[PDB]
C-alpha cells in the first residue's frame, strides 16, 4: 500500500528516532564536523588541533620570551560507511507498521555498532583509571564513591574546562550506587550520571614483573618527515615504551609506573595519584604503546615550549617497576570531559537526480551527529527492492588523558 514517498520518509524517520534513542553515549561525545566538507569519497586523516599550552611569560619586555610556541594536532579516520544492505520483501511493505519494524531492525544494528564503538574506545583508551578494592556502594565504610573520586581526580588534574564531566555506569553499579530511575527515562537521562548496557568488561592482565628497559624521555613533537619528504603532523596521543617483556599485555590494559605521578595540567604541581597510562598496541615483544605521552617536568632536554605540555613529575627511568591496575575482571565505568571524545561525521557524497534506477536520500541525525544515506533499488531477480542504509562517521578519543575508567573490586 505504501508509495515511494512513504518508503523514503517513514524509513528515514524511523532510522533517526531509533538511532537517537538507542545511543545515550554517542550523544554526550562532542560532534565535530570537518571544515573541509570534501565532495570526494576518500577517507582523509583529519588533523584537529588541541588546546595550546604556553610557558609562563612575565615582564614588560617579551623580546626574549618570544611568541613562538608549540602546536600539536590529533588525527581521526572515517574509514568506511557502516552499511546494512538487505532486501525489502513484500511482507515488509504490506503496511506502515511492518515497514517501521524492518527499518527499525536495521537501524538498531547500526546504532548498536555506534554504541559498541564509543564504549569500547572509552574503555580501552581511558587514562584516568581509578581503582578501589571495595565495590561501588551508596554509603558505607567499605564502599567506593566512584563519582566523587572521578570528580576529584578530574578537578585535581585541571583537565575539565569548568563545564563539567559526564559519568557512565554499567547498570549493575548504577543500581549499587543508589541512583534512582524514577522521574528519569531509560539510561537515567532527564526527559550528568547515566547508565549504558554497552559498557564492556575489562579482563584482567596476566602480566607480572615488567620493568622499563633503559631511561626513556618523551617529547611533544609537532611534525615529522614522511617518505615523500613533506612535513607531516605527529599524533602526540601515544608514546612507545620499551619494556622488559610485554607478555600478557593487551589493548585494554591499564599501567602505572612506580615513582611516576601526575601534575596539575595548568599549575604543574605534583599530585598524590600515581601517573596512569593505558596501552593501545603491543607493537613488539618489548615495545608497547601507552596512550598519554609521559612528558616529564624535570627534563633538561625539554625546551620551555615543550615543557609546557608536561603531565608527569619525572621521566621513565631504567628498571622502573610497572604496575598493572586491572588485576581483576570487572565491568568498566567510564567518564570524560567535554572534548575527550569527538564523533566526526561528514555527509556522504552522492547526487540523487542522476540515476533513475537507484533512489538515494541523505539524512542527518543532529542529536548524535551522524550523516548517512538511504538508497532503494528494484531487483528483478528477487521480484522486490533492495534497501541500503549507510552511516559515515568516525569516533576519536582526543585528549585520552581526560577519559577515565572506574574499576571496582580490584582485590587481586
Amino acid at each position: 500500500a505504501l508509495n515511494e514517498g512513504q518508503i523514503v520518509t517513514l524509513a528515514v524517520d524511523e532510522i533517526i528516532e531509533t538511532i537517537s534513542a538507542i545511543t545515550p553515549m554517542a550523544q554526550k561525545a562532542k560532534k565535530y564536523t570537518p571544515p573541509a566538507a570534501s565532495m570526494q569519497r576518500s577517507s582523509n586523516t583529519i588533523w584537529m588541533p588541541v588546546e595550546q599550552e604556553s610557558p609562563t611569560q612575565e615582564g614588560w619586555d617579551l623580546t626574549d620570551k618570544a611568541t613562538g610556541l608549540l602546536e600539536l594536532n590529533v588525527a581521526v579516520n572515517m574509514g568506511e560507511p557502516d552499511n546494512d544492505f538487505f532486501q525489502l520483501r513484500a511482507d515488509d511493505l504490506r503496511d506502515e507498521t511492518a515497514y517501521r519494524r524492518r527499518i527499525q531492525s536495521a537501524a538498531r544494528k547500526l546504532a548498536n555498532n555506534v554504541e559498541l564503538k564509543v564504549a569500547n574506545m572509552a574503555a580501552e583508551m581511558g587514562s584516568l583509571v581509578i581503582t578501589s578494592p571495595d565495590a561501588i556502594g551508596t554509603n558505607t565504610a567499605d564502599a567506593w564513591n566512584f563519582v566523587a573520586d572521578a570528580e576529584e581526580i578530574m578537578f585535581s588534574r585541571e583537565l575539565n574546562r569548568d563545564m563539567g564531566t559526564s559519568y557512565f555506569f554499567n547498570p549493575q553499579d548504577y543500581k549499587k550506587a543508589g541512583y534512582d530511575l524514577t522521574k528519569r527515562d531509560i539510561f537515567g537521562r532527564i526527559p550528568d550520571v547515566l547508565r549504558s548496557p554497552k559498557l564492556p568488561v575489562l579482563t584482567k592482565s596476566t602480566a607480572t614483573g615488567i620493568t622499563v628497559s633503559g631511561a626513556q624521555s618523551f617529547k611533544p613533537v609537532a611534525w615529522q618527515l614522511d617518505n615523500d619528504g613533506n612535513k607531516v603532523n605527529v599524533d602526540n596521543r601515544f608514546a612507545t615504551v620499551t619494556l622488559s617483556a610485554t607478555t600478557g599485555m593487551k589493548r585494554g590494559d591499564k599501567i602505572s609506573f612506580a615513582g611516576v605521578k601526575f601534575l596539575g595540567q595548568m599549575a604543574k604541581n605534583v599530585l598524590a595519584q600515581d601517573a596512569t597510562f593505558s596501552v593501545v598496541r603491543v607493537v613488539d615483544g618489548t615495545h608497547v604503546e601507552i596512550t598519554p605521552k609521559p612528558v616529564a617536568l624535570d627534563d633538561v632536554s625539554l625546551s620551555p615550549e615543550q615543557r609546557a605540555y608536561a603531565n608527569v613529575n619525572t621521566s621513565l627511568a631504567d628498571a622502573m617497576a610497572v604496575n598493572i591496575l586491572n588485576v581483576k575482571d570487572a565491568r568498566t565505568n567510564v567518564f570524560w570531559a567535554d572534548d575527550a571524545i569527538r564523533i566526526v561525521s561528514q555527509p556522504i557524497p552522492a547526487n540523487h537526480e542522476l540515476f533513475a534506477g537507484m533512489k538515494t536520500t541523505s539524512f542527518s541525525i543532529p542529536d548524535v551527529g551522524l550523516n548517512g544515506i538511504f538508497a532503494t533499488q528494484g531487483d528483478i531477480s528477487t521480484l522486490s527492492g533492495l534497501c541500503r542504509i549507510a552511516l559515515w562517521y568516525g569516533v576519536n578519543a582526543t585528549r585520552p588523558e581526560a577519559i577515565g575508567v572506574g574499576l571496582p573490586g580490584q582485590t587481586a
Binding site: E4, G5, T9, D13
Partner: peptide, 30 residues
Amino acid sequence: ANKDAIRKQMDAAASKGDVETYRKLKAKLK
C-alpha cells in the same frame, strides 16, 4: 479532530517525500 487533521497533513508530506516536514508535524502531534 485536530489530531486527525495533523495526521492528514503529515501523511500528505510523507507522500510528497519531505522527511523534515513529516518529522515536524509528528512532533506537533506528540
